[PDB]
DNA sequence: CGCTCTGCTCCTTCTCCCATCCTCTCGATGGCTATGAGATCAACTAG
DNA sequence: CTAGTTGATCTCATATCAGGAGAAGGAGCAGAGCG
């Protein structure tokens, strides 16, 4: 066995098991038990933050530390796709706990309200969904539950959303959150995921935005002075420092030669429009609608949709062979037949991804125009059937592309029986993307991955690539270093309805790093 | 208090355009600003902007 | 002997009000405030 | 009983001059006690 400080021991084929940063990940875990805090497993998607979770509460429960005896009952909140490869994981790797889940799916077949109780008063595993938290507070909250482990808990991420307001009911002070991507579009995502790990590390909303948010932000503008670029690198520093002991987050890069994956490619192609999607491109910018939107008196989003409903494929205007959604009417989709072809003669499998239900019917349309066989998960499709699909792709490789909604195809789910992914239309959050790409780059993927982000050059697209690089960096900024480059591409304004087609410290170390503090 | 719909009715025009009362533009614009602060007191906001 | 407490006057706001009933025409009024993905669920529509 | 499809319902997330008349407050101030 390997034993930690105090009384914590993993046992020694769980521990085997494991890599070398999945059991630093798992002493992390438990020093932020000690401490009665939680904290977010940020480490990227892919290297295995199930696995982690999973062994520390089985070293919990095997090393029956002192209230609750060992491990108590808790609560894995995450989304409705993954809630049986939860259970499929707990199974194999720490068979002794009871699973359940609270969902209409579920195994149960009584009250509810009976689970809950159930496994509050026998120290199981509840697995539900943040659909299930929002719904269910009322019963969810009045058990004491052990820990709160939230999965992709960045559907936190808004302070506002019930969801956040019911999450942050657990009285427990062992809440962790599970997100390789726990920063999205700002800082105030980063507030409300701390501020259900641990309330007061970052202030009030009001503290953290004056503090951090405004400066932090504002030295990432292309225009910014130096003076406010310095106090942006100053905040940035200084907020990587408070979130250092709760932040846990490992990349693909210092684990990979630990880790044996294969290469990766990261590919972003620039579609061109077609003559004819260029035609409706045109007629709508110069359309009457979008100089309302420039002069506010209609909604933006309105002219945002529809132009990237332009660019995924005219199915404003439906145009034989010119059925609704033929695929040589958009530029994308003859990318995207051109590296189907290819792909296929050389023997590969495909992950295709899109923002959007709509597009994803064309698609599916168009592959069935091919002879190739295909399958398709979006949120329509029912949750009791996802996780066999994912296991069907994974297993028989005769089925070539799986076809996959970024919101549902996206978070958490392994896939890697697809060596090629390709991301059909950006989305704003940059995370969406972030997620759906590395569906594919995971412990597990035997052979090379590339992945292919379409955007239709001089379009909306490129312009929503330019906000979520903006964001990224902005993320970058507070996770990976606060030297980041200012994105200078663009200023990032409302003329993105313009088609523009190409062609003890001993009081000196604390002295000199506040004289180096403020002299920034 | 916001009055019923009695003391302020929406009036149906010669077409489907119903036309609203002067109280309920009024009690429009009140809300309007009224979740506006509430949002500018619950998030970043300057004391200036909150006056 | 310097402070207080009147209380008188002049000005200044400030606010309220301005007959009853009746007929007709004429012009303006627009107000518009999205979208979609996902989850939930309950009812059929089959099995 | 068992799935599966289909609406409805709800959550969430994406972006930059020809008035008048009276009533109330305030201010300047003269003056009387009086400490
Ligand atoms: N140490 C390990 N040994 C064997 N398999 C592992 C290990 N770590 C992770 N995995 C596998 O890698 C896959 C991806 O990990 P997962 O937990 O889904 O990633 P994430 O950290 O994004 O949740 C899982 O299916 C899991 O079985
Ligand atoms: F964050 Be996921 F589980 F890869
Ligand atoms: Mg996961």
Same mark, same amino acid.
């Given at each position: 066995?390997?034993?930690?400080?105090?009384?914590?021991?993993?046992?020694?084929?769980?521990?085997?098991?494991?890599?070398? &940063?999945?059991?630093?990940?798992?002493?992390?875990?438990?020093?932020?038990?000690?401490?009665?805090?939680?904290?977010?497993?940020?480490?990227?998607?892919?290297?295995? !933050?199930?696995?982690?979770?999973?062994?520390?509460?089985?070293?919990?429960?095997?090393?029956?530390?002192?209230?609750?005896?060992?491990?108590?009952?808790?609560? =894995?909140?995450?989304?409705?796709?993954?809630?049986?490869?939860?259970?499929?994981?707990?199974?194999?790797?720490?068979?002794?706990?009871?699973?359940?889940?609270?969902?209409?799916?579920?195994? &149960?077949?009584?009250?509810?309200?009976?689970?809950?109780?159930?496994?509050?008063?026998?120290?199981?595993?509840?697995?539900?969904?943040?659909?299930?938290?929002?719904?269910?507070?009322?019963?969810?909250?009045?058990?004491?539950?052990?820990?709160?482990?939230?999965?992709?808990?960045?559907?936190?991420?808004? %302070?506002?959303?019930?969801?956040?307001?019911?999450?942050?009911?657990?009285?427990?002070?062992? #809440?962790?959150?599970?997100?390789?991507?726990?920063?999205?579009?700002?800082?105030?995502?980063?507030?409300?995921?701390?501020?259900?790990?641990?309330?007061?590390?970052?202030?009030?909303?009001?503290?953290?935005?004056?503090?951090?948010?405004?400066?932090?932000?504002?030295?990432?503008?292309?225009?910014?002075?130096?003076?406010?670029?310095?106090?942006?690198? !100053?905040?940035?520093?200084?907020?990587?420092?408070?979130?250092?002991? &709760? @932040?846990?987050?490992?990349?693909?890069?210092?684990?990979?030669?630990?880790?044996?994956?294969?290469?990766?490619?990261?590919?972003?192609?620039?579609?061109?429009?077609?003559?004819?999607?260029?035609?409706?491109?045109?007629?709508?910018?110069?359309?009457?609608?979008?100089?309302?939107?420039?002069?506010?008196?209609?909604?933006?989003?309105?002219?945002? =949709?529809?132009? #990237?409903?332009?660019?995924?494929?005219?199915?404003?205007?439906?145009?034989?062979?010119?059925?609704?959604?033929?695929?040589?009417?958009?530029?994308?989709?003859?990318?995207?037949?051109?590296?189907?072809?290819?792909?296929?003669?050389?023997?590969?499998?495909?992950? @295709?991804?899109?923002?959007?239900?709509?597009?994803?019917?064309?698609?599916?349309?168009?592959?069935?125009?091919?002879? &190739?066989?295909?399958?398709?998960?979006?949120?329509?499709?029912?949750?009791?059937?996802?996780?066999?699909? =994912?296991? *069907?792709?994974?297993?028989?490789?005769?089925?070539?592309?799986?076809?996959?909604?970024?919101?549902?195809?996206?978070?958490?789910?392994?896939?890697?029986?697809?060596?090629?992914?390709?991301?059909?239309?950006?989305?704003?959050? %940059?995370?969406?993307?972030?997620?759906? #790409?590395?569906?594919?780059? *995971? =412990?597990?993927?035997? !052979?090379?991955?590339?992945?292919? #982000?379409?955007?239709?050059?001089?379009?909306?697209?490129?312009?929503?690539?330019?906000?979520?690089?903006?964001?990224?960096?902005?993320?970058?900024?507070?996770?990976?270093?606060?030297?980041? *480059?200012?994105?200078?591409?663009?200023?990032?304004?409302?003329?993105?309805?313009?088609?523009?087609?190409?062609?003890?410290?001993?009081?000196?170390?604390?002295?000199?790093?506040?004289?180096?503090?403020?002299?920034? | 208090?916001?009055?019923?719909?009695?003391?302020?009715?929406?009036?149906?025009?010669?077409?489907?355009?119903?036309?609203?009362?002067?109280?309920?533009?009024?009690?429009?614009?009140?809300?309007?600003?009224?979740?506006?602060?509430?949002?500018?007191?619950?998030?970043?906001?300057?004391?200036?902007?909150?006056?």
């Amino acid at each position: 066995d390997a034993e930690f400080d105090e009384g914590f021991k993993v046992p020694g084929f769980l521990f085997k098991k494991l890599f070398k &940063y999945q059991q630093t990940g798992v002493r992390w875990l438990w020093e932020l038990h000690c401490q009665q805090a939680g904290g977010i497993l940020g480490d990227e998607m892919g290297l295995g !933050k199930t696995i982690q979770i999973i062994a520390f509460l089985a070293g919990l429960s095997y090393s029956k530390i002192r209230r609750f005896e060992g491990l108590g009952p808790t609560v =894995i909140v995450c989304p409705t796709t993954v809630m049986h490869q939860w259970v499929k994981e707990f199974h194999t790797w720490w068979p002794p706990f009871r699973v359940a889940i609270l969902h209409e799916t579920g195994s &149960y077949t009584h009250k509810k309200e009976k689970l809950i109780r159930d496994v509050a008063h026998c120290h199981g595993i509840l697995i539900t969904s943040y659909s299930y938290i929002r719904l269910m507070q009322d019963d969810i909250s009045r058990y004491d539950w052990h820990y709160v482990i939230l999965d992709e808990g960045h559907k936190i991420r808004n %302070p506002n959303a019930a969801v956040t307001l019911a999450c942050k009911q657990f009285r427990t002070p062992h #809440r962790i959150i599970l997100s390789g991507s726990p920063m999205q579009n700002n800082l105030r995502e980063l507030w409300s995921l701390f501020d259900f790990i641990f309330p007061g590390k970052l202030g009030t909303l009001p503290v953290f935005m004056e503090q951090f948010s405004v400066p932090i932000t504002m030295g990432g503008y292309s225009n910014a002075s130096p003076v406010q670029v310095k106090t942006a690198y !100053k905040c940035a520093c200084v907020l990587r420092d408070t979130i250092n002991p &709760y @932040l846990l987050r490992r990349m693909k890069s210092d684990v990979k030669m630990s880790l044996s994956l294969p290469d990766k490619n990261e590919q972003v192609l620039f579609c061109r429009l077609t003559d004819e999607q260029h035609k409706v491109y045109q007629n709508f910018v110069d359309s009457k609608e979008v100089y309302r939107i420039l002069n506010g008196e209609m909604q933006i989003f309105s002219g945002l =949709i529809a132009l #990237r409903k332009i660019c995924n494929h005219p199915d404003l205007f439906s145009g034989e062979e010119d059925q609704f959604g033929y695929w040589k009417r958009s530029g994308k989709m003859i990318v995207v037949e051109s590296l189907l072809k290819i792909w296929h003669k050389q023997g590969q499998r495909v992950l @295709l991804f899109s923002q959007s239900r709509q597009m994803l019917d064309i698609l599916e349309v168009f592959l069935r125009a091919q002879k &190739y066989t295909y399958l398709k998960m979006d949120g329509t499709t029912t949750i009791a059937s996802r996780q066999p699909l =994912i296991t *069907r792709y994974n297993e028989d490789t005769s089925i070539f592309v799986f076809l996959l909604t970024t919101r549902v195809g996206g978070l958490g789910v392994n896939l890697t029986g697809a060596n090629r992914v390709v991301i059909y239309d950006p989305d704003w959050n %940059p995370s969406t993307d972030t997620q759906a #790409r590395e569906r594919a780059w *995971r =412990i597990g993927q035997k !052979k090379q991955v590339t992945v292919y #982000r379409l955007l239709t050059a001089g379009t909306i697209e490129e312009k929503i690539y330019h906000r979520q690089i903006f964001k990224q960096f902005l993320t970058n900024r507070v996770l990976k270093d606060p030297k980041q *480059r200012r994105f200078f591409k663009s200023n990032d304004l409302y003329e993105l309805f313009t088609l523009t087609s190409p062609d003890p410290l001993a009081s000196s170390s604390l002295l000199a790093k506040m004289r180096a503090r403020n002299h920034l | 208090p916001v009055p019923p719909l009695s003391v302020r009715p929406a009036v149906v025009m010669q077409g489907s355009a119903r036309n609203q009362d002067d109280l309920t533009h009024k009690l429009a614009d009140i809300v309007k600003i009224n979740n506006q602060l509430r949002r500018n007191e619950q998030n970043g906001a300057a004391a200036h902007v909150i006056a």
